[PDB]
Design a protein around this ligand. Structure first.
Ligand SMILES: Nc1ncnc2c1ncn2[C@@H]1O[C@H](CSCC[C@H](N)C(=O)O)[C@@H](O)[C@H]1O
Ligand SMILES: Nc1ncnc2c1ncn2[C@@H]1O[C@H](CSCC[C@H](N)C(=O)O)[C@@H](O)[C@H]1O
Lengths: 333, 339
């Protein structure tokens, strides 16, 4: 631990060259892989069954910064880079268009954005389809505030609900429900999918994007006492990392209609772009953090928090040419 | 067209039993290797996408497109004409049958008073076994063959198993107003096409809290119509005519959960089916005294009886090599329990 604590202190202060940080991240990822893979497909399949059965015993459960690091859509999730020259702003729009296509959004439908973030998707379909009725759901006051203000822009077809989702109930029915990278923060997917399914009209569809590993699934919990990486961005226990196949195991109340995966290079590049915008803008970010926080030290730590955020995303999803950790798209009916 | 003539001669020689086993095996491995190169994709996105093409394509199709004295020689005492389960290097075919049958009963969670449907029952090994272990179960076997029906009913009577019933039906067109607490499908789906139509039909036969247990052969990762990769592929049609079978992926029926919902998934190493076929080949070879004359008096003459020998040798060697390939970690069996 003390070696871990010393590295962590060095990272907080920004004293480690990026090349060294990536090298150390890869060491941990290599170990995750050896831990994740099994010598036998029987074991590999059994491990998924262990995780899904125990999940079934559980319960479900600053804007000037974002405008700098994110593209102009404020999409705080995976973007889509066809072509080497694709920019972040193009990659946001492409990913957003991809959701519309795969989730089969059509002009006069009621659309639900479950876990809307901030809220690139709801604003995107609301503007593209003036006869859609779009509902965004979030448990953040700040986010609800922003999407409401941004909805003008003269958008009359946007509604935001401030709710927990874990505990939330409602009478309403939607033709299309979109969940982009929400489930990683949930646990009992059986109960979650059951709630959401009551919100889907009979001929409606649920579209889900989640991060994953192509073969194994796990609690994002540190591997052992010197896995400094698993808790470098998130506190342990807050996230799960599904396999590409994971939600094929949760079809009690919905039924899989299509399944795609996208290479980890996309999310890797996404983070890369975020990091470039961060490092190219410390001139305004540092004072901003200094004001928001109390002092210089805490502002310097916050900066390197965001660095580690991006670097984690870069190396993890870019590992082995994006052919280990990736994105999965699932359409249910 | 040199390649092609070479192939007609190889088949000529294999048909007359002129090629040594080790050479046959080597030749089979070369075809298996090309299958793997064809089935595996450079990116997982393409791999996943290849599955979808197949499952979406099957939904566009229709539901679908041997002397017992021979079976008693080559199979074990249960006449299980499907995968058996070998723990221990010393395990015999008869034991591997039992062990496998008991595994079905456990993973299918059979309880003693339930109604049980054995869909596509072959020679009745599972129906006879269930009816014997669980005396209060009503067991119903289904088959489209009058021979198999006769044999199973006669074994019921003989073994004193009154809780057996055999229905003569084509599962493709079959309809009934019955409902069963548990339904067992052992290696029938490889002969069907539209799994959405088939599983909807079967799901109607499950009672409310009932379960469906399925065993199927598969590849770990990819799925395919059992058809020749290309004109050099003599192996894919070496045993079955083309278009008669489908090799699913381990995960394949996970994509057909419109009407049933997966509760559990397991897989078994390919070594088990590989040893199954090996025991079958051993028995075929140690009993030619009986089998050759039996084939002769059932075929045109002596030559036809020989090519029939070698056709079965091909059946077992295909099974051996395919499922034992890469230590049983490519082609294998999948068990799926649905509710
Ligand atoms: N329990 C909960 N109830 C409602 N919303 C939640 C939630 N937990 C997380 N969220 C929302 O889900 C988001 C996960 S990040 C995904 C945001 C969005 N799909 C985008 O990428 O642009 C959080 O930012 C928050 O807005
Ligand atoms: N269309 C159909 N209708 C009813 N039964 C069929 C069928 N097509 C195949 N079958 C049955 O399905 C079997 C496939 S082999 C599986 C048999 C058995 N489960 C065992 O392991 O021994 C055939 O033996 C035949 O009895």
């Amino acid at each position: 631990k003390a070696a871990i604590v010393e590295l962590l202190k060095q990272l907080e202060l920004g004293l480690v060259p990026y090349d060294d940080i990536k090298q150390l991240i890869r060491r941990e990822l290599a170990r995750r892989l050896q831990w994740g893979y099994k010598p036998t497909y029987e074991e590999q399949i059994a491990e998924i069954q262990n995780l899904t059965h125990s999940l079934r015993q559980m319960k479900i459960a600053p804007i000037e910064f974002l405008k700098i690091m994110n593209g102009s859509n404020l999409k705080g999730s995976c973007c889509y880079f066809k072509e080497d020259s694709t920019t972040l702003d193009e990659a946001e729009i492409a990913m957003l268009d991809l959701y519309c296509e795969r989730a089969q959004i059509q002009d006069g439908q009621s659309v639900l954005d479950l876990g809307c973030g901030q809220g690139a998707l709801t604003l995107h379909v609301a503007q593209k389809y003036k006869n859609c009725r779009v509902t965004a759901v979030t448990n953040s006051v700040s986010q609800k505030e922003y999407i409401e203000e941004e909805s003008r822009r003269n958008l009359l077809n946007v509604e935001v609900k401030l709710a927990d989702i874990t505990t939330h109930e409602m009478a309403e029915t939607y033709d299309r429900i979109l969940v982009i990278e929400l489930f990683e923060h949930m646990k009992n997917y059986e109960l979650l999918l059951r709630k959401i399914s009551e919100w889907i009209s009979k001929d409606g569809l649920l579209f889900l994007e989640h991060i994953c590993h192509k073969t194994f699934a796990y609690h994002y919990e540190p591997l052992d006492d010197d896995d400094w990486f698993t808790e470098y961005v998130f506190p342990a226990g807050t996230m799960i990392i599904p396999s590409a196949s994971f939600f094929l195991y949760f079809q009690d109340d919905v039924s899989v209609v299509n399944h795609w995966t996208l290479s980890g290079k996309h999310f890797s590049r996404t983070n890369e772009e975020w990091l470039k915008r961060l490092d190219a803008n410390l001139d305004v970010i540092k004072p901003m953090f200094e004001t928001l926080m109390g002092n210089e030290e805490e502002a310097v730590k916050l900066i390197n928090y965001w660095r580690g955020f991006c670097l984690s995303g870069m190396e993890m999803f870019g590992y082995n040419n994006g052919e280990e950790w990736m994105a999965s798209h699932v359409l249910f009916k």
